[PDB]
Structures are given as structure tokens and as C-alpha cells.
Scaffold this active site. Sequence first.
Site, short mmCIF file in Angstrom:
data_model
loop_
_atom_site.label_atom_id
_atom_site.label_comp_id
_atom_site.label_asym_id
_atom_site.label_seq_id
_atom_site.Cartn_x
_atom_site.Cartn_y
_atom_site.Cartn_z
N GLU A 732 0.39 -1.24 -0.32
CA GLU A 732 -0.13 0.10 -0.09
C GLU A 732 0.96 1.68 0.10
N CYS A 766 -2.78 8.64 4.06
CA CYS A 766 -2.65 7.70 2.52
C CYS A 766 -4.08 8.38 2.20
CB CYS A 766 -2.46 6.28 3.19
SG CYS A 766 -0.70 5.59 3.98
#
Lengths: 976, 976
Positions: A732, A766
Site C-alpha cells: 500500500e 494515505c
Amino acid sequence: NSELNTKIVNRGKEFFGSISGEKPSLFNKGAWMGKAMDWSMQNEQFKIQMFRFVDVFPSLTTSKLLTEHIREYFGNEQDMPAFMAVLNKVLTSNIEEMARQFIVGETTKEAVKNLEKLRKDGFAAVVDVLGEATLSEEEAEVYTNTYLELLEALKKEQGSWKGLPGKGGDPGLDWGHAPKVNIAVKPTALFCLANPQDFEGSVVAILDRMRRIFKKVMELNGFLCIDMESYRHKEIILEVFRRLKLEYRDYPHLGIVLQAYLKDNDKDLDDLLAWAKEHKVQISVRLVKGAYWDYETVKAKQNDWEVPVWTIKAESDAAYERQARKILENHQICHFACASHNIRTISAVMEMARELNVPEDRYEFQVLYGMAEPVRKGILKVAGRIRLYAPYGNMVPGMGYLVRRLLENTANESFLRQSFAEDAQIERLLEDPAVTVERERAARLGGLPPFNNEAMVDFTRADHRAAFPKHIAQVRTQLGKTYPLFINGKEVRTNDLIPTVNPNKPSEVLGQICQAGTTEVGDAIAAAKAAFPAWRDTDPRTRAEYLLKAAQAARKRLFELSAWQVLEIGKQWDQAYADVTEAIDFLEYYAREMIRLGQPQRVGHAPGELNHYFYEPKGVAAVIAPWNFPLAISMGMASAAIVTGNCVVFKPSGITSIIGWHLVELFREAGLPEGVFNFTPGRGSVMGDYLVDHPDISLIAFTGSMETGLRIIERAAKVHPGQANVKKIISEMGGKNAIIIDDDADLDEAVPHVLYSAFGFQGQKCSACSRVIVLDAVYDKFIERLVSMAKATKVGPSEDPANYMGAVADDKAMKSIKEYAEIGKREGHVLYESPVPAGEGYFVPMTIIGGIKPEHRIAQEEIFGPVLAVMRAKDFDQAIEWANSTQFALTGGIFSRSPEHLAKARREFRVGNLYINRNNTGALVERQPFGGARMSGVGTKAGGPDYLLHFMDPRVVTENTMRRGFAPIEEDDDWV
Amino acid sequence: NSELNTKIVNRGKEFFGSISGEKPSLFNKGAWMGKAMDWSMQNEQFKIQMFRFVDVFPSLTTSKLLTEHIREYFGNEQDMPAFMSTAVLNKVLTSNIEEMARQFIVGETTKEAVKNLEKLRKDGFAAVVDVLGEATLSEEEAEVYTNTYLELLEALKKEQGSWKGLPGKGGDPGLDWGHAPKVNIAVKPTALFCLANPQDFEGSVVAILDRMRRIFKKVMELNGFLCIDMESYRHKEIILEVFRRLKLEYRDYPHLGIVLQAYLKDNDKDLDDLLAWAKEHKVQISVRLVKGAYWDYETVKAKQNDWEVPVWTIKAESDAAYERQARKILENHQICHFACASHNIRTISAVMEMARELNVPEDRYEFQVLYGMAEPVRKGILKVAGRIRLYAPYGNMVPGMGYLVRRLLENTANESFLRQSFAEDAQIERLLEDPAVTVERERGLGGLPPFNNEAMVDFTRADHRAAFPKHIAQVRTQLGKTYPLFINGKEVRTNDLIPTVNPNKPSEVLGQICQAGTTEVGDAIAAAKAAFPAWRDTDPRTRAEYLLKAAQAARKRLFELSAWQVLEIGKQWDQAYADVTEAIDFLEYYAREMIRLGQPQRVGHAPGELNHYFYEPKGVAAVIAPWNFPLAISMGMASAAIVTGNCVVFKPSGITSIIGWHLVELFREAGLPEGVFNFTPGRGSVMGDYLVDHPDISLIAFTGSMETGLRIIERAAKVHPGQANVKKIISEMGGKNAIIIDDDADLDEAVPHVLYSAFGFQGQKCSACSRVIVLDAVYDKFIERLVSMAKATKVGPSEDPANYMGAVADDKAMKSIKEYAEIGKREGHVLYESPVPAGEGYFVPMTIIGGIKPEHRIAQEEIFGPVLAVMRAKDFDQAIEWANSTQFALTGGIFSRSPEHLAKARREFRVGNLYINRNNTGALVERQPFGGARMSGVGTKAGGPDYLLHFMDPRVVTENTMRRGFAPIEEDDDWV
Ligand SMILES: Cc1cc2nc3c(=O)[nH]c(=O)nc-3n(C[C@H](O)[C@H](O)[C@H](O)COP(=O)(O)OP(=O)(O)OC[C@H]3O[C@@H](n4cnc5c(N)ncnc54)[C@H](O)[C@@H]3O)c2cc1C
């Protein structure tokens, strides 16, 4: 008693007979409105379209917007109901008329005129300035000065007003006793950051404006009533009322709303009454049922909180009768406004006042303007003291109010609807709601309860507010420890120590972390590899149990674990608590997921044959974790690998190593077998590649920068000598996430959601919004409001809940983010740059920059800080194109009320998590499985039902069950 | 016909009456056998354990083996049933099992058999003698079986003169009952040829006929009767033809019989044909009419291949069929002698009364029963008819196991007449009912039927046998073409051509294939990329519909597509057809899988919120396909990528480029939009890395060698400029597959399954058995039988069905495999090395090498050819250790009948697809999802429910549905 009840029913029956035939305007099917409401009550799909159309209507400012939205909400003109460019004019005028049903004017001067007319018709009023949930200090000032302006107008006119007729007393006062000037104020319209998370600061800011209004009110001997709003603000508002009251202990014309629909209200009303006695002051209560029922229920269940409202309508009715009785009993110290349109409810108050022989100057009746006309006429005739709640202002500020009215009038459980839309069952309508209550209460895997997200912190609670400073203090008694490696069940110390400090106050050292060299990393991998065979052979149900144990361990330390994060990485209180609950959520969810996936499934259905399909772990998993969600992400990836039967070597981020140590503590408490979880903080330049390149590693779970993640992917692709498997990659790698603001967006929702998405936790997510792409036609308006709210926020230490955001992670982050901010300022134009505190701390200003286009660096590169780019899209097509213009695709948002544009965004705005009409952060386990593709990741979604498979590989065993022409018959065999 | 039927019932009633309550020994609860069967009939779990134990018993030749299996099948002494109580236990159980074997068997040897036959004559019984054995494994064994009959005949030849004829009503006093030869034998045709297979119809008939003829001459020599038994449906037509030809060589000789099975649907026609055939040839026949011995087997076998079940499925139908056909035989007594073979009293009575009504001469019909069974029935026949013959088998328990287990099944089945009469106390009126009466009384998602595997080629069918040579000749009219690239719906021709040839006859050129340079590949990629947005946006249901059309197109061309493979890559007829059916299966399965996965799932249950979880494609997929499953794997990987919404650039293996062109043909006929599928055969050395490295490739599906697979994995990991996604790798990289032969294994099953696993398609399967790991104690015997069967097989062109295997793929493969054989010959010792044909062709001998150990190259490296390593393991633990001693883990097998060893294997023999007691090749879609980890792949399993997800990425749309405090309530919502 059944004696009082009889008198109440009989009075209700007389109230109905004296009203015979007369219907409220809203239920008159001979006008457009009654026809529209009627069809909405008959067709739920239509109610949803109509009500949503009304909400968006005032933003439909061009002929294009209107025409397209009409078709998108009501279909083609040959297809709409019969009662529904000409089409634009017909609908506009009808909807406009419907809006003014409930307002006494758009402007102050208009309001005063219409108010002065109502007196001539015999009606008192309480005046409200339309508005709520203000977005800036400047907006709160406009709201405040509007009341100031209103009061000046009324002051100059009240002297010329004859007091409304009464039974005696002062002919200059209404009914001989009531002040002629009476106003209501909504507290949340006085402070844009009203939030029980900053309780004291919210109270003060609101109090200071309310005091300014109250002083003017008292100059003309008027009445100020303080409205009650959503449950989130109830305790704030109660405390504002108490302080103001005590500042003017002898002034009796100050009221507060209490909402009988709240379970809290029986106590709140007892408490307030006891408080008033203790302090020898008088009070006034407007008792209402409550205006936000659907909202409170929905919001409670989205956060796994206790629903604060009763869930059975008659329980609010019964509560109201209870509480009204209590108030009237206390008439000596508590003045009473009955605020209901319900004839049962009203008749009940009237009989109770008679039974308790309450003097008439101690209670009056109030209803909302534009509603329940015959009821209002009935009150006027029989009691004589009726006050209309009379709001004024424009349609956008009034929308919440207006929609609440249509909800109120058309709900299935609406007393008005049941009286005036259905064939009225008078006996059922007038029955004691307590009896109604009792009757409706009468009507109403693997041994594990199903998954529910852990309850969020709830700052409406005193104990939750008090918990944080206490636990922050407790954490501070335990600083300065040296944290060892944890390998094969043992603590291992090294000589290489790195201190971890408080980012909001770097001189505060929280502890020292031993770094593992390659020798210790090698040992941990070996320990992991050795524990593997027995762990892999452990029953999935047993393995899941350890996770469940670790979750209980964490649950018990929730506030303590949160406090560590507040200090070590600069999480705000809510952000910290949310990080721990998510960790807990991962534990509970993956436990259940392994139990589900743990049983072999027969595949195929041919007889004489059994095929079983099942999953097995890979081996040793390297978990390389980020600092930004130091417990949640770490625990997610580690527990995932562990529950699936792998053993873990875990490298926490340096600056959050103590949080990493919390995993050690939790798995220890769960009794996890030695070697199954190993904690090896280390310098990435020393042991980074080593961990990734090692031939005994079968899986790498990583969250962090794209640069690092892509390097890992490239290095892990090589099969070294001795390497049993092709290395599985869970990566990720972040995003450059955009929120689109369509020209029909609700800006009151859009602005604070955008501000939070961008600057929540300093933008260190994020998922954070780093690009807001605003449609040309609302740009100037949206931007002005965004900057205005931003200017209200405060940058400072995360341990102080008054601060919106604080220092970023470390000095490297600060240096890199500041460089990006300078680049951004050259590419675009600064719109806002916040002050930062003087002195130490890794502070970066809250920064908003306009003039940004897809070509710019800050439109492309992840900054991972409080720097928001604002981009001006010419139309909705370009907005979509621009949203898709980066190499990332993690999260995204859109504020829009156009079904077509939403349909387009669902299809074309291709991110892993797209959010519609809310912020694009705060993904919850199960509800929003998290993760994207492109350069954002490899398409693995944590917290979802496909995640665990990534840590395993499937096997099939096929057995020929036939021996010598004899095979056993299985249940699901295709047979004959 | 009620009149005939009443006689039958009455006759049956007298029959039961004369029995006087006597039970056959097996139903005598006085004896151990009766108790064991009674408990088996009451408890299905015990039945399964007992019947399987009997099966394995004669191979428990050492004390530990025996002691262990007893505990594994029945548990500890103290827990097993009373009748099982008393190593002493070994002795008691051995004793009871031996006695139950002797129940059905007149002896172990010829001499013992002869003496026991004379004893039966003394009791009034005639005999038909059988030598225990079926499904022989070699010529040497077929010879032993033949010579046993010859030995038997020589013995009876000397004895029969001394035997007095059994009493009759007239005829010749030297003949049984005055008319039947004293020596009557029955022979099983599959005991006479180990490769009996209708795929080689003529070769099977001749081989069997040749041995049958030698036996028959000896039979005629003593004026004896020979009956040809009928076996499983697979050989029925072969056996019928064997009979026809033998009968015609000796048209004078009346004593030749054939078994017809009334449980077959074919039997009405078969009986009719045979009768007419006899009339046309002016010869007499003899039919032993039976119901049939293989009912469960036929049902299972048909279901497992999606064939028509050849047997009636309602028991009464077999009974009704028997009565019909018996009547027809009796009516045709002029030319058809009749043996009534049944233990059913209703059936027997029917025959008897039907024969009296037609006044059939007694020399034209006799009755038969199986030795050791239905004793009271047998005595009943002797008294009433006088003419009763026992089927008397002899031999050892291993050869007799099939027969024996059939008897256990036959006496204990729920539908068994004997069980119903003698165990279940059934009403007699019901047992004697006209079975025709009994017959009369006893008689998917998204619009798509559920998935079923496509029907396999069935060479019991004459049209199927005849179809292959005709389609092969048709294909030969199509040779010599030039095959172009196919890009964006257009044919693109290049001037670099490579011929493809027949590997069994290289001078036969099948055509010329254009090679794509890097230029054309780039064009293909660009075309796929441009078609992608509209394909991605195509409804998943619509995408699936194209796969279904492609499937239908292929189904219409099944034999044609199969013939191409026979010639181009040297598949055998069945191997070719199975390749095409598997392609069809992928199309049908993946269509259904996409329809399943294409509907967005609501996730979470919070109100005011909708989360939908769904999947999207990645982009352009490179499909690089092998030559060994040239339609199946190609269509598999490509249609998966296609249906999930990717567009495909497809590189077929060069030597199977025409089969690759079939995908172009199929997708064209399906009407697939241009650019979704592109066909670019090319030189790996020219465009290989180029296709893999390309920035616009998002996914690579590869099946082939480890070296190339790992190269692709490494290169794909790098993210080049312009590259939108991290490349998703789907790789299948072969195996070094072992089958373990445990010391209790059924060797009659193991041997031909190992041979087929190792040598089917010349061993050119990723799944192929290249290591057979054999336990010390059975090694020498296993090897003898394996080498003996191999020696029987012939190597040659795959277009001739008589050959077992043919040439390998191409010259390079031939040379490489031969080098490995030479390597193996120096590591171990050659056990078998076949002849190969003279002249042209890429022939490699069927090769078997023993003395092989884990550290040897041919025990580690994948040869991909007809070279089998034989490894001798000291004990089961070493067998498992050795099985796990390679870097691969694709398929595996174990033949064992030890519950503990199977359980150990399920756990520890960690391969992707493990097979118990069958071959480890021929995985079917759905039933056997195929693929492994370690160096065999990356855990993706084609044909399974996890496969499609690898070609996509998940997305979530989260929508806040609340507007102004109002949200629609949904069904799945958590509410109040
Ligand atoms: C002058 C005036 C001022 C007001 N000021 C405020 C204020 O400052 N803050 C505020 O929150 N409200 C306020 N209200 C109340 C609100 O605006 C509605 O008018 C009122 O709640 C309707 O009650 P009723 O007796 O008229 O109608 P009814 O039909 O009798 O009562 C409907 C009420 O029942 C409750 N209810 C509906 N469904 C359920 C259920 N399933 N379970 C339990 N309860 C249910 C809700 O409170 C709903 O409003 C005010 C009302 C008036 C007349």
C-alpha cells in the site's frame, strides 16, 4: 390515573369536534403542496426524490442546472405525476411558495412587518434568525449582528404595541405578564468549531456571543430562549445556559429547550430543576419532543454508540407528558412553554395545569409558523396564550429547518398526518401514550457474535472528556525506558539506541529503542521459520482465538494506548482513539475471517469422488510498518499474517517504535507461541534490504512511500538459492487524493468535510485530500468559505484538544513538507497559511494554495502534510479528467447532488475508495475495506473479505472413494 | 397380463412356503458372517469400514500391517461390536474373513475346485466353473489365466467320464438332465487382454478373440460348454463382437454362451439384434440373462464423465426388463438356449410360468445361481425344476476381491431381493408384485443452468469411433495454409514464416505461421489499450455472453478441433478431445463466475450509508501459452482475462500456433469486439521481453517452464515510465510430481494409474507423474507388474488409436528428453525401454528407471517426457519426506488403504493437487481447481472459484445517503 386520563381524552375529543373538517394547509389536496405531500406519503420512492430536490433546489441557479436536475429527479415530463422554459417556472414558483409557508420573511424589515400583523391576529411570536452550524467567525458575527439588528427594530416598535388580551395584570405586557419581545437563538450558529472534544472552548465562544445578544435582549426587557440542537451539543448548550443564567441571576426571561425524545431528559430535567433550587434562581423551559430523530439514530449506529433517542414514537409522547407534569409541579421556579402540535399532548398539559392549579402566567403554548393551523386556532380559542415560532432568512440557510418541517408533517408516526391524511381514529389518537407504549413493546457464526466495529470515543460523555488528560499524565510517569528487540519469546538488547521523542515537543524524550542488526534480524527470521511448522498445523479456530484474546487485551487499555499515540506521533485525541479501535477491529474481523476460511469446502458434486479445497500459509512474513497509523496498520498486517498461519518478523517505523512495542505487549498477553511474532526495529539502511532479500521470507506486507514500496517489489521478485517460494507482496503506497465539489454541492457539508480530509492529523494519511477540484461556478463561493473556516482553526500540540492539528511526524517530514510548500507557492498562489506556535515543535502551517493544474508538482507528488491544492475545473467532465490525472488511485470524494454526475463518478472516478457527500478519510473495517491499485498498491484491501487469501495459497485434495465397485454416498452427490 | 401374473404370484407363494423360514447363511444371525452383515446393514458407517477392510485384508501380510489396520478400521478392542470380540485379535479376525471368502469360492486351486465340484454333483448340482480374475495387467498374466483354464479342462477331461449324468426327464443318459454337457466354464474377456479399450476397438477384439479361441478349442475337444461373461459397459460392445466372431468360426457348435445384462438400457435392442443376427446366419445361440453386477460402478463412472448412465436407475425397471427379455428368449427357444441367472423368487417364478405357458422344452432352459448364496432358493429350484447350476469360482483372495465385494454389495443393498426377503421381513405380496406395476408406481442462477463439465468422448459409441478418422482426413484437406497475426479485428501478415509440422511425421507440414516483430506486438498492445475503456464499461453479463457463444461455437466443432491437435502436437484421440472439452469448460465456468462476481455487494449494515464492493479489470493482459494443452490452457487464461474486462495480447507457443488460431476463430464467431483479443505468435528471442517489459501491460498470465516463468516475474516487477499499474503475475511453472505406492495399496488399480500418469501424452503434462515412490515391501511386485504392463503398450503415431503414446513435441524436446534418459541411465538402472517405430518422427522410448534417490538429477529436474523415476522408500515417513524433496509442489498421488497414512498425506504431502487412489492427471474444471505454490506457481488455481479475482482489482463506493437529516431506510439496514 384513569380519572385524569378521562378528562384529557374528553378534552381532546372536544378539541377535535371544534376543529371538525378544518385541515392544515399541508394536507389540502386542492393546492399543489398538499398534492405533492400526499403523493410523497403514498410513494416512498417519490418522497425521496421530492425531498432531495427541495434540498438542492436553491443551488440550481442557471437554466441548465435546473432543467437537468428536474429530469434527473422526476424523469421526463410525460412521465411525472400529473400535478408536477415553462417546466422551470412552474416548479420554481411552487417550491418557492412551499418554502415561504414556514417563514415570516426573507429579511429583518419584512419579518418585523409580518410579526406586527400576527399580533393584530392575536398571536405572540418567538423570532428566530434562520441559520445553524456556522462555518466561520465572520459568519457567526453576521448571525449575531442580525439579532442585534432585529432587537433594535423591535425596541423602537414595542412601545407602540398594545399588550395581547389576558385575564388581567399589566396591559402593556402580553396577556398581562409576558414580555412582548421574545427571540430564539441556535448555539451552533455562534461558533463554527463547536465540538465537545473542546468542551470548555466551545462553551466560552458560544457564551460570549450569547451574552452579547442577551445584554441587548435585557435592555428592552425581552425574553431570550436558547434552542437545543443535535445530541452532540446538548451538554455544551446546557452549560452555556447555566453560566449565562448565573451571570444574571435575577433576570427571569431566559429559557432553554429540553428534548423529551432523549433518554437523558428525565435526568437532565431533574438535574436542572435541582440546580435552579440550589442556586435560588428561576428558569424557563420550552419542552419539545425533538427535531433530529432520524439523524440521531443514524449517527449513533454509525459509531456503535447508544442511540440517545427513544425508538418508539409513543415513548417520546409518554416522556413529554411525564416531564411536562414534572415541570408544572415545579411551576414556582420553572416557567413553562408547551411546544407541540399534538392535540393529545396539548390536552394533557391543559388538564395537568388545571389539576395542579397552575397560575396561567406560569405556562404558555407555542407552535411552528405555517403548521397545524386548526390546532393553533383551537389553542387560541380555549387557552388564549399562543406563541408562534417565526423564523426568517433565505432558503439556503433555512434548508435544514424547511426539510425538518416536511419530515415532521409527513412521517408515518406524525400525529398531524395521522389526524389529517388518514381516516382519523380519534380514540387511538387520544389514548394515553403509555398504554400505546406497553402494547408496542409487546409486539416487539461459530459461537461468536457477528462482527461490529468497536465503539468510537464519545466526548458527549464527561468520563471520556476526563479520560485523556488523566491517561496522558499516566503515560508521562512511565517515560525513559529502553525498549529491546523481541525474538523467539525473549527480550534481546543491543548497543545501538535511537531515542523516540514527542513531535509537538522534541525536548520530551519518551524512550530509547534498540536497533537490530542483520545478525538479530537473521535470528528472528530463523526463530520464525522454526515456529512455523507447529503454528501452521495449529487449528484455524485456535489461531483466531489468540487474536480475540489480543483484542480484549487492547480493549481494556483503549485510553492508555491512545495516550501513547498522542505523545509519540502527535495524534489528536479522536485520531488516537480511532487508531486503537481500528486495530481492535482488525483483530476481531480477521479472527472471524479465518474461522470462515478455515473449513475445507467440498467442490464439485460428482459421486465416488471427494474434492476438498482449502488454504495454507506460506511461511515467514516480513511486516514493514508506517508511523502514521502505528497501531492499526501494524496490527492489521501482522494479525492477518499470523491468523493465516504464518510467522512474522515485524519492523516498526523508528518514530513509532513504542507503539510497535504495544503489539509485543498484546500478543504476549494473548499467550502467543514463541517465535510466531518477532519485533525487530532497525535502521533501514542497515537491515532493510537484508530482511526483504532473505531467502527464508515468503511474504512481505508493506505500507509506506511508493519509492520504497516499488523498490521492495523489485527486489522481492528475485528467487535466491534456497528460497522455497515466489515472494508474495502486499503493498500500500499512498495517494494524491482529490475531492470534487460540483456546482450543486451542499457547501455547508462540503467545507468542513474538505477541511478535515485535508488537515485531519496534519494531512498525514494515505487517504488524505491533497487536491480539491472545484467547479468553475461555485469556486469563488466555496473557496471564501473554506479559507474562512480554516482561519478559525488553530495549529498546536495534539495533547491540547482546542487545536485542530499539530506538528508533523519528525524534522525530516517538516523539512520535506516545507520544501513542497515553497514549490507550491511558486506554482500557484497561496490562499491561506496558518500561524504556528513559536519555539520547539515540528510545525508546518496549515496551508491552502490556489491556481493549481494537473501539470504542477503539488498536483502530482504526495506531500503527506497539511498542504491542500485547489484546482479550478471548467465543467464536470474536466473535473473527472483532472481527478484521474495522477499516477495514484487510492481514495477520492465528490460533493454533488446530481444523480447523473454521481453515476458518472461511480463509474469513472476510479479509486479504491470513492466517497459521496462526506470526507474521504476514516475508512472502517468491513464497511470500507481499504486499498487501491495503480501506484497506490497491488489491489489488496485490508479490512475486507478478500484480504486473508493474500497470505495463503489454496490446495485441493481429491479422493477416489470407490473400492471394488463400492463407494459411500455423500449428501451433495449428483445421484440417480 | 393378469392371468399369467396370478400363476406367477401363486407359484412364488408356494416357493416361499416350501422354504419354511430358512435363511441363507449370510442372513443367519447365528454365525459371525450373519452378525457382521446384519450390523453392516443397520449401520452404514460400519458397512463402509467392514467392506473396505475386507478389500485391503489379503494385503495385510505382516503382523504390524494387520494389527495397525485392524485398529484403524474398527478402533480399539474395547470399543468395537460384541461379535468382533475375543495378537489374538489378528487371529480371530483373519479367521472370520477367510471363512467369508470361502463362502463364495469352491477352492484356491484347480485340484481343490475339481474335488469340490464332484461333491456338488453328488448333492444334485451342476456347475459353471470360473477362474477368479479380471482386468489383467500384462500378456504374461493373460497367459497364466488362459493356461489355468486349459489346466482345468485337462483335469475335467479325465474326470467327466466317471461322472454319472444328473437326473432328467429324458434325453441322453450320459448328459446332465439328459442334454447338457457336464463341463461348463465361464471366462472373463478383460482377463485376456490388459489394454482392452474401445478406443482400440479392433485391436481389443482380436487380442481377446485369440485367447478365447484357444480356450474354446479345448472346450469343444471334450464337448463342453463355454460361456463368455459380460463385464462393465466399457467393454460390452467389444465382448459382443468377440462372441459373434467366435460363434461364426464354429457355427456347428451349439455350446457357446453369452451374458446379456437386463440392467442395461441397451439390452432390449442388444437382445433383439443378437436374435436377428443368429437368424440371418442360421446358427443357434445361448444367452445367460442376468440383471448385472456393476450397478454402482456404472452409475458413478457415467456421472464422472457426464455420460448417459447406461443402467436403469429404478431397481424394479431391471426386474421388469428381465421379465420382458426372458419372455422374448423363451419365445425364441428354437434358436436361443436360455440360462436363467437370478436369486429373485419373483423372477424365477416368472421364467418358470412363462416357460410352461409357451410349452418350452426343458432342454432349452436351465437355472443358475452363485455358489455360496441364497441356499434355500437354490434348493427350491432343484426340487421344482431339477435343473440348477452353480457358478463356482476359484482362486486366491486378491484375484477374487472384485468378485467377493460384489457379493457383499449384492446381498446387503437396500434394493436387494434377498435382503428384503430374509433380513427385512418384507411382505410376500409386495415381493411378488409384477415389477412393471412396481415401476409405474415408483415413477442455476441468472437464467443459466448450473455448470456441468462437457461430456467426454465415449468410444463405446460407434459414431464416436468413426468420427475421428473422418475428421483427421478432413483436416488433411486443410493443410498448407499461411496463418497471419490477428490485431484489432484485422489480419496482419508478416514475411517471417515458421512451419508447424506433424511430430509423428515431420515431413507432413501443417502450415506456415507469420511471426510478429516488436512492431506488430506494439500495435496489438495499442489496439488492446484502445478497446479497453469500452470493454471495461461493458456489462459483465454481456461479457459472459461472448464466452458462452464461443463455447457453443467450439461445441459444434468438437471433433474437428480435436483432429487438429492429433496431427499438430501428437495428442491421442481422447487426449485431444479432453483438451477441447476443457476449453469449453473454462468458457462455461468463467462466464458463470463473472456473472457471480459482477454484481456489487453491499458491505456493512450501518444506516444512512451505502458501501458497495465490486471488481474492475486492470488493462491489457499478455497471455503467453504452452504447447501441451494448446486449446485448454490458452482459452483458459485468455477468456479469464477477457471476461473480467481486460483486453488480451496472446502469444501461442510456436509449435501449436494453428490451435492458437482456433481462439481467433472462436472469438470471431462469438462476435467479440475488435481489440479485445489479439493473436500475435512471435519469436521469444525477438519480442518476448518486449511484450513482458511493455509499460502498457498490466497483467501477464503465463504457463510454461520455471526458467521463463521466473524471468518474467523478475522483469515484470520493474515499473517503467508511463506504466499505470504494478504488473500482476499469473504463472504456472510445472512440477516434479510423485505418486506414493504404499505397502497396502491395491496394485491392480495402482499399476495402470501410474502408467497413465507417467506416459499419457508422452508424459508431456505439468501434472505428470515423473517419480513413483514405492514402499520396500511391495516394490519388487509393483515393479514386475508395471514393467509387464508397459511392455504390452505400443509407441507410435497418435492418429492410430492402437498406440498408447507417440512422438514428443518437436526435435528439441526429443533431444533434451533423450539426454535426460541417458543421465538417468547413469544415475539409476533401466527397468524398461520401449521399441520406437523405424524412420521419421520425434520418438522417445517409454522409459522406466529404478534405483533413483532424491539427490539424483532425474529425481529433481522436470524432464517433460516419457521417463519415469522409480524410488524405493524404506518406510512411509521416508516416502513422504522424498515426495516433498523437490522445489516443486504441483500435483501428487498416493495409493494407500490405511486411514492413518492417508491422513498423514493429506496434511504433509503439500502439493497443489493431491490425488488419493487414482491418477494425478486430468484435473477437471470446478472439481479440481489446478495450480500450486513453491516453484510450481504463485498460488493461482485455474478452473476454481478464486481465479477470476486475480485478473481484477476491488473498488468500494461509499455513499452518505442522508440529506438534511433524512435518509432512506434500506432492507439490510441495522435499525430500531
Ligand atoms: C415552537 C417550537 C419550538 C421547537 N424547538 C425545538 C428545538 O429547539 N430543538 C428540537 O430538537 N426540537 C424543537 N421542537 C420540536 C420539533 O421541531 C417538532 O416540532 C416536534 O418534535 C413535533 O412534536 P409534536 O407533539 O408536534 O408532533 P408529533 O407527531 O406528536 O410528534 C413527533 C415527534 O416524535 C418524535 N419521534 C418521531 N418518531 C419517533 C420514534 N420512532 N421514536 C421516538 N420518538 C419519535 C420526534 O421527536 C418527532 O418530532 C420545537 C417545536 C416547537 C413547536
